[PDB]
């Protein structure tokens, strides 16, 4: 499977200041748990936000740096190379990489963050007439998690 795993607010917005705008352990759980085992792919930018590779998975960077070479991390140099990539292969972001993925994948998990934040990088729009709705799932609320959530998986249409 091609998937995009990704959480934007109820304006679309990913990023601000190459950080996630919002505070919410649930949804990292939720990333933790779809990815785990399997592979993520990344532009650099984002993989410099993350700081290191995430553990007990595979982490793929995609970047023009052919100087870039990290402990832990596979690059790669083109979006074709995705293609090639064995198993269930997660799109991890940023605007970018969804930009050129999103009409590729075959289905995307996304965390929808139901407030307005402020953002400087956005998910493209996608209508529901494209997108089933194989799941969608209200996050829980509490001490440590205080923004109301929705995981939606999506399937492509048709
Ligand atoms: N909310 C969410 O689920 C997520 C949000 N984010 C947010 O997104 C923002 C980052 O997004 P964005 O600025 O787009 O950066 P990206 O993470 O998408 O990285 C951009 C870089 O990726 C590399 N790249 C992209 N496409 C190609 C290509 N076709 N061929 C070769 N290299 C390529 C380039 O690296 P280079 O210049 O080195 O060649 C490019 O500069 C951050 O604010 C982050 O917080 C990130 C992940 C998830
Ligand atoms: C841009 O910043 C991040 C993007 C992301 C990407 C990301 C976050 N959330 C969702 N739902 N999808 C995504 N693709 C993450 C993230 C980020 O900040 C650390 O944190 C954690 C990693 C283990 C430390 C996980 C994801």
């Given at each position: 499977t091609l998937s995009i795993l990704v959480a934007h607010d109820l304006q679309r917005v990913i990023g601000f200041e190459n950080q996630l705008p919002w505070h919410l352990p649930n949804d990292l759980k939720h990333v933790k748990k779809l990815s785990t085992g399997h592979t993520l792919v990344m532009g650099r930018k984002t993989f410099e936000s993350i700081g290191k590779p995430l553990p007990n998975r595979r982490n793929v960077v995609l970047t023009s740096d052919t100087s870039f070479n990290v402990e832990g991390v596979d690059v790669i140099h083109?979006?074709?190379?995705?293609?090639?990539?064995?198993?269930?292969?997660?799109?991890?972001?940023?605007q970018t990489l969804f930009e050129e993925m999103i009409d590729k994948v075959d289905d995307m998990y996304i965390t929808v963050i139901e407030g307005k934040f402020r953002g400087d990088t956005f998910f493209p729009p996608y209508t529901f007439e494209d997108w089933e709705v194989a799941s969608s799932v209200e996050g829980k609320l509490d001490e440590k998690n205080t923004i109301p959530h929705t995981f939606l998986h999506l399937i492509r249409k048709k």
């Open positions: 083109s979006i074709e190379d995705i293609y090639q990539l064995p198993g269930h292969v997660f799109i991890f972001g940023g």
